[PDB]
Amino acid sequence: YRIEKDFLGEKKIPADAYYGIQTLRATENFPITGYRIHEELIRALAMVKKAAALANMETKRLPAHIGEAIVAACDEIIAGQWHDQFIVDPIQGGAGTSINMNANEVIANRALEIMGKKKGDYFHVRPNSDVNMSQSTNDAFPTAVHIAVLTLLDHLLETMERMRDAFAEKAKAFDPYIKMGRIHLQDAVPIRLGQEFEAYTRVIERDIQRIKQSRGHLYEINMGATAVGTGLNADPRYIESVVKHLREISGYPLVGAENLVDATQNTDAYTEVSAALKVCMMNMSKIANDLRLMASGPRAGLGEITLPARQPGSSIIPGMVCPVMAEVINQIAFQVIGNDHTICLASEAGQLELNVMEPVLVFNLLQSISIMNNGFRVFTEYCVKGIEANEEKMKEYVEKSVGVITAVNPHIGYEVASRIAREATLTGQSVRDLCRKYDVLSDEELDLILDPYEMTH
Template structure:
């Protein structure tokens, strides 16, 4: 049997709405108008917007503008949404025209119709609980949606920072674990001088700590909200006391130290807080991609590559090559980094596309910013758990390559001079002899002096080599 419908009307006309649906006519118009990504509104944004509606209802009740009987059911409905109920009723596409009006009205209609149900009224009987007049009271899309986005982004960033801290600790643990592994260092992808594998992972930990600092600083700007700004920041239709109350209630509901922006016109026009957060994510993505490139190269092989790192095997690597295992957890982190870098460009274009009193590109900013935060968190989580935690060093191979390399010749510069040292390398390449044997044959240094100068671990500690040279001189 066909589902029964109800007829809803707006100033454009009327539409048939499934009788059981909590959404209404403006949601359906958005569904028809914007079949764009197929991706619904992000759950964290739904939670945040429901919190905004709850806080607004509480503040409007304090102002004696919203009848308690209606305000209480709006609050109850908003709480249900925040608990994860009715999520299937949020059906508008993430990318849409209208600066987020469709997202706002989807929420308003769901809360209004659930409120009507709690009042024992039929859905669509908006005289008793109206999406615009009651749920959206003292608000505009232009303050409700930006505030919800700031809350959602802040919460995502807090989760990401926790995950980054775990990855940072993972790098630090590998720094300690690999402190005794001296390997060939490389510049220009060519053999350079010895370095500890632990030092390389220590550098990864350091750059990640700076990424965390940047993200923490950017997060602070998201706590400034423009609730009460309404349409253009002038606060039309919102009482001054309401502006203070709604921010206080929203802080209590979310547990965040939210505060009203110093200039509501500025806070409504400008979107630099999102751009700053995205920029911090982009820098982190670039750094993570570089780290992943290093790890993939060091793990390349197992016979024809560098073969310095041993990654945990997560899945078969080929449908045709038996036994092949690919560095999939590192590759996925690379790809996430590329996506975040691309998202940042989209966000930059959208943030620069505002005109006058409003940036209407909010939906694409929200879509990309929340996606970047979410996939960075998920990617760093699996990268840490499935790649870094059980990562091991191919110690025997690393030592063998170091012993056969010319990387320690640099330590001889102060004793033999650059030209003599370069000539020794050239002869070693031509004759296949070792550097040590050539130096001893020529009588340039004694075996004791060589052992003193060319100890690889000493060459990886700043200052020691110079001090030893002065002592020998």
């Protein structure tokens, strides 16, 4: 077992632990969710401390002795080694200092090991002065967040690009199938199933464009802002360097933000991304609700489509297939939305030079992106691609629908057709037979006028 000390006092650290006291304080201070910070944040945090070491060696302020040990340790965390040592709670006080410190304390103790030394020999490698040199919480943490968010969004757009492709196929596959369009859930006018799926396809096209764009503002990073944006204690040479390194390390077209005070106090890049995602899920939640409708049944329901069975839907009803893949999408949407409200609240709570609510914000932000990526992947494969149509059921609905009379409207007028249609719904007779009862159009005119393939117009 180790022992370490701080203003507050002395603390017993497990000897296996690469994490230090400031992390131990925060695990005691903020036992809130007991989740762990997103994996992709840890990776990003390591990329930053590395670029920071690299830059501090380039400006001959950090000894290459220490910096290379740090760089070595970073590279391992980047590779995915020491994640289990990041143990602070995503929901935490101190504006994300206890996250920054968790990285500082782990990268140090593992740079020690790599110098052959032992953990807690902070003398050789110092969390504050060496790992975190030229840096504050207030530039490292967000710069990480920016890179994390970007990586996840890029995963998202891949998954969505695939999802769009999936819907697009079903557009083509179902293009020739005729069905009843519904409006207020009331039977309206003929439409082809495939036109509905094109509709889905295009809203998704748009979601992709909006989420793509949300990234633009993230490419700007506040590195070398230090405390407030003033960039005190940072050498412009370090600032120029640490960015180029971050650009190389990350593989992202990052750029120093033109105003550092601005990029340090404003959280609008995040609210913007969340906003784009919320929109996305509103759309998808709807499309989900549609599929669940059309798949209602299989007898006392619309029964226009069928979705791949993925599990026994019920515990007591034999032969129960529930639309569970859509359902999960619905539920995800409810998350993302609720998360947006958290994000927004947090974004607003900012005061003067710093927003201290960044943690819960980022927790929800990153969560939102991940959840969607997962939901979409499973939904693309397990449900969407496997959707099948009941054309005979769908054609039947057309053949027994008053609503076809919307085609006889420009010859007979809305008033003469409204009365024929009110009579047909009540008596339950075909529209054709009530047009021959009133003798309002001829039979050879009805064969033409009341022909279902009027969707194309």
